[PDB]
Amino acid sequence: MQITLARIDDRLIHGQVTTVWSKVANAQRIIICNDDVFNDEVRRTLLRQAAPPGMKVNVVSLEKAVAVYHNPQYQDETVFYLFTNPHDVLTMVRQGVQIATLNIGGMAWRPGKKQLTKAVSLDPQDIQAFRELDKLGVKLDLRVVASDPSVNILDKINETAFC
Numbered sequence: 001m002q003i004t005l006a007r008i009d010d011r012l013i014h015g016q017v018t019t020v021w022s023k024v025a026n027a028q029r030i031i032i033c034n035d036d037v038f039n040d041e042v043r044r045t046l047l048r049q050a051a052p053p054g055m056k057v058n059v060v061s062l063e064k065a066v067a068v069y070h071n072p073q074y075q076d077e078t079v080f081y082l083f084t085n086p087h088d089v090l091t092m093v094r095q096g097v098q099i100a101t102l103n104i105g106g107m108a109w110r111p112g113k114k115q116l117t118k119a120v121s122l123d124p125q126d127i128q129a130f131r132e133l134d135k136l137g138v139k140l141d142l143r144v145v146a147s148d149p150s151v152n153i154l155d156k157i158n159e160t161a162f163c
Contacts, residue, residue: 001069002078003098009105010084012037013050013057017145021105022052024146027080029056033065033092034084055080062088066095086129093136101139104153116156119144130154131163 005025009018012032022030030051037043037059044059051057060068065081068074069092081099083089085107093099107113109121116122120142134140134154142151 001074002076003081004078005103006081006083006089006099006101007103007105008083008086008089008107010108011106012082012084013047018050019052021146022055022080025078025080027055027078029058029077030080030082031065031068032057032059032082033062033088034059035061035088037084038064062091066092066097069097086126086133089138090129090132093133093138099138101141102133104140104142105144116153117142117151120153122157127157127161130157 004027005021007021012018013030032047037047038061047059048057086102086104089099089102104120107120107122107126109115113121113123113126130140130153140153142153142156143149
Protein backbone atom coordinates (compact mmCIF):
# COMPACT_ATOMS: atom_id res chain seq x y z
CA MET A 1 0.00 0.00 0.00
CA GLN A 2 1.09 3.56 -0.76
CA ILE A 3 -0.08 6.01 1.91
CA THR A 4 -0.73 9.37 0.27
CA LEU A 5 -2.40 11.03 3.28
CA ALA A 6 -2.63 10.07 6.96
CA ARG A 7 -4.95 12.33 8.92
CA ILE A 8 -6.19 12.57 12.49
CA ASP A 9 -9.72 13.91 12.21
CA ASP A 10 -12.19 12.45 14.69
CA ARG A 11 -15.17 13.60 12.59
CA LEU A 12 -13.78 11.21 9.96
CA ILE A 13 -15.73 11.79 6.72
CA HIS A 14 -17.64 15.04 7.02
CA GLY A 15 -18.86 16.73 3.89
CA GLN A 16 -16.92 19.14 1.71
CA VAL A 17 -13.84 19.36 3.92
CA THR A 18 -13.14 15.63 3.72
CA THR A 19 -13.96 15.58 0.03
CA VAL A 20 -11.38 18.30 -0.65
CA TRP A 21 -8.78 16.41 1.35
CA SER A 22 -9.63 13.23 -0.58
CA LYS A 23 -8.69 15.01 -3.82
CA VAL A 24 -5.39 16.18 -2.29
CA ALA A 25 -4.70 12.58 -1.33
CA ASN A 26 -5.70 11.23 -4.77
CA ALA A 27 -6.17 7.81 -3.18
CA GLN A 28 -8.17 4.78 -4.33
CA ARG A 29 -9.23 3.80 -0.81
CA ILE A 30 -10.05 5.74 2.33
CA ILE A 31 -9.34 3.53 5.33
CA ILE A 32 -10.68 4.48 8.75
CA CYS A 33 -8.41 2.80 11.30
CA ASN A 34 -10.11 2.45 14.67
CA ASP A 35 -11.16 -0.50 16.87
CA ASP A 36 -14.35 1.09 18.15
CA VAL A 37 -15.72 2.71 15.00
CA PHE A 38 -15.61 -0.72 13.31
CA ASN A 39 -18.09 -1.92 15.96
CA ASP A 40 -20.80 0.75 15.42
CA GLU A 41 -23.01 -0.46 12.56
CA VAL A 42 -24.79 2.85 12.09
CA ARG A 43 -21.56 4.90 11.93
CA ARG A 44 -19.84 2.36 9.65
CA THR A 45 -22.88 2.57 7.36
CA LEU A 46 -22.76 6.36 7.30
CA LEU A 47 -19.04 6.14 6.48
CA ARG A 48 -19.46 3.64 3.64
CA GLN A 49 -22.33 5.67 2.17
CA ALA A 50 -20.16 8.78 2.32
CA ALA A 51 -17.53 7.39 -0.09
CA PRO A 52 -16.58 10.04 -2.65
CA PRO A 53 -17.24 8.98 -6.26
CA GLY A 54 -14.47 6.77 -7.63
CA MET A 55 -13.14 5.97 -4.15
CA LYS A 56 -13.72 3.06 -1.77
CA VAL A 57 -14.20 3.41 1.97
CA ASN A 58 -13.29 0.77 4.54
CA VAL A 59 -13.60 0.85 8.32
CA VAL A 60 -11.17 -1.48 10.09
CA SER A 61 -9.57 -2.41 13.35
CA LEU A 62 -5.94 -1.51 13.91
CA GLU A 63 -5.15 -5.22 13.68
CA LYS A 64 -6.76 -5.47 10.27
CA ALA A 65 -5.27 -2.13 9.12
CA VAL A 66 -1.79 -3.56 9.75
CA ALA A 67 -2.64 -6.93 8.18
CA VAL A 68 -3.97 -5.49 4.95
CA TYR A 69 -1.03 -3.06 4.80
CA HIS A 70 1.30 -6.09 4.75
CA ASN A 71 -0.79 -7.99 2.16
CA PRO A 72 0.96 -7.93 -1.26
CA GLN A 73 -2.45 -8.01 -2.96
CA TYR A 74 -2.61 -4.27 -2.15
CA GLN A 75 1.06 -3.49 -2.77
CA ASP A 76 0.40 -0.58 -5.14
CA GLU A 77 -3.00 0.57 -3.80
CA THR A 78 -3.10 4.24 -2.85
CA VAL A 79 -4.53 4.95 0.58
CA PHE A 80 -5.91 7.86 2.60
CA TYR A 81 -5.84 6.89 6.30
CA LEU A 82 -8.23 8.42 8.81
CA PHE A 83 -7.55 8.17 12.55
CA THR A 84 -9.33 9.64 15.62
CA ASN A 85 -6.22 9.99 17.75
CA PRO A 86 -2.42 9.84 17.74
CA HIS A 87 -2.13 6.71 19.95
CA ASP A 88 -3.51 4.56 17.16
CA VAL A 89 -1.11 6.08 14.61
CA LEU A 90 1.74 5.22 16.98
CA THR A 91 0.50 1.63 17.35
CA MET A 92 0.49 1.10 13.58
CA VAL A 93 3.81 2.86 12.99
CA ARG A 94 5.44 0.58 15.57
CA GLN A 95 4.14 -2.37 13.54
CA GLY A 96 5.82 -1.36 10.29
CA VAL A 97 3.22 0.96 8.75
CA GLN A 98 5.34 3.65 7.04
CA ILE A 99 3.80 7.06 7.67
CA ALA A 100 6.35 9.75 6.80
CA THR A 101 4.10 12.66 7.69
CA LEU A 102 0.95 12.78 9.76
CA ASN A 103 -1.67 15.45 9.14
CA ILE A 104 -3.56 16.58 12.25
CA GLY A 105 -6.92 18.13 11.40
CA GLY A 106 -9.38 17.67 14.23
CA MET A 107 -9.15 16.47 17.82
CA ALA A 108 -12.38 17.43 19.54
CA TRP A 109 -12.59 18.92 22.99
CA ARG A 110 -14.08 16.92 25.84
CA PRO A 111 -13.72 17.20 29.67
CA GLY A 112 -10.15 16.22 30.57
CA LYS A 113 -8.65 17.83 27.47
CA LYS A 114 -7.12 21.29 27.24
CA GLN A 115 -7.58 23.21 24.02
CA LEU A 116 -4.35 23.90 22.16
CA THR A 117 -5.70 25.88 19.22
CA LYS A 118 -8.89 25.94 17.09
CA ALA A 119 -9.95 22.37 16.31
CA VAL A 120 -7.28 20.63 18.43
CA SER A 121 -7.62 19.74 22.12
CA LEU A 122 -5.25 17.42 24.01
CA ASP A 123 -4.46 15.62 27.22
CA PRO A 124 -0.97 14.61 28.43
CA GLN A 125 -1.37 11.14 26.91
CA ASP A 126 -2.07 12.70 23.48
CA ILE A 127 0.96 14.92 23.83
CA GLN A 128 3.18 11.99 24.77
CA ALA A 129 1.99 10.08 21.68
CA PHE A 130 3.01 13.00 19.47
CA ARG A 131 6.41 13.09 21.17
CA GLU A 132 6.89 9.39 20.46
CA LEU A 133 5.80 9.86 16.85
CA ASP A 134 8.35 12.69 16.44
CA LYS A 135 11.13 10.53 17.99
CA LEU A 136 10.38 7.94 15.27
CA GLY A 137 10.84 10.57 12.58
CA VAL A 138 7.16 11.16 11.77
CA LYS A 139 6.58 14.69 10.52
CA LEU A 140 3.70 16.40 12.32
CA ASP A 141 1.56 18.58 10.02
CA LEU A 142 -1.26 20.46 11.73
CA ARG A 143 -3.81 21.78 9.25
CA VAL A 144 -7.56 21.71 9.48
CA VAL A 145 -7.83 22.40 5.75
CA ALA A 146 -5.17 21.82 3.11
CA SER A 147 -4.86 25.51 2.22
CA ASP A 148 -4.07 26.42 5.86
CA PRO A 149 -0.44 27.13 6.81
CA SER A 150 1.16 23.97 8.25
CA VAL A 151 1.99 24.12 11.94
CA ASN A 152 4.34 21.70 13.70
CA ILE A 153 2.06 20.52 16.51
CA LEU A 154 4.93 19.82 18.90
CA ASP A 155 6.39 23.28 18.38
CA LYS A 156 2.92 24.68 19.06
CA ILE A 157 2.55 22.65 22.28
CA ASN A 158 6.05 23.64 23.32
CA GLU A 159 5.18 27.36 23.02
CA THR A 160 3.36 27.22 26.35
CA ALA A 161 4.65 24.07 28.07
CA PHE A 162 8.03 22.60 29.00
CA CYS A 163 9.78 19.88 26.92
